[PDB]
């Protein structure tokens, strides 16, 4: 309240809506995948067991920040470009499910 002066949040206009169905994923970074080992065939369940992801929210998304220092195959729901080249450079596939 502002002593009868028009309050801030009516001076300003509303905008936007909510897309009731969003696909937002529990994200796992590149450097968070160097807690696995070489060649080892990671999966969403395996990384849930490892606890790197506290819950699979609507899938798993691999993003690219750090480095592998490794050579291994993966299987997740969605990938970014950087993730793709970063996996393929060291060798190892990424089977999208």
């Amino acid at each position: 309240f502002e002593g009868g002066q028009l309050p801030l949040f009516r001076r300003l206009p509303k905008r936007g809506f909510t897309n009731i169905n969003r696909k937002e994923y529990a994200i796992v970074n590149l450097d968070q995948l160097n807690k696995f080992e070489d060649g080892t065939e990671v999966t969403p369940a395996l990384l849930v067991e490892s606890g790197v992801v506290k819950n699979e929210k609507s899938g798993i998304k691999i993003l690219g920040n750090g480095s592998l220092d490794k050579k291994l195959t993966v299987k997740a729901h969605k990938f970014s470009a950087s993730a793709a080249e970063a996996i393929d450079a060291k060798g190892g596939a990424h089977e999208v499910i």
Binding site: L12, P13, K14
Partner: protein, 64 residues
């Protein structure tokens, strides 16, 4: 009991990464014949809630 949220405000501000609040701009609904072309694209942006007003409305948006 559980504290409520100003639903009138939750539709006006998005929370930003450092805890700021991104707000939309005013003077942007009608009467555009009386405002300059400079005023219009400089109003086609987003500003941040000023800290003075933040001190005033901190709790109205605590759950955002």
């Amino acid at each position: 009991p559980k504290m409520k949220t100003h639903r009138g405000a939750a539709k006006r501000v998005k929370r930003t990464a450092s805890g700021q609040l991104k707000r939309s701009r005013a003077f942007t609904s009608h009467l555009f014949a009386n405002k300059s072309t400079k005023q219009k694209r400089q109003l086609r942006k987003a500003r941040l809630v000023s800290k003075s007003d933040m001190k005033r409305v901190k709790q109205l948006l605590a759950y955002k």
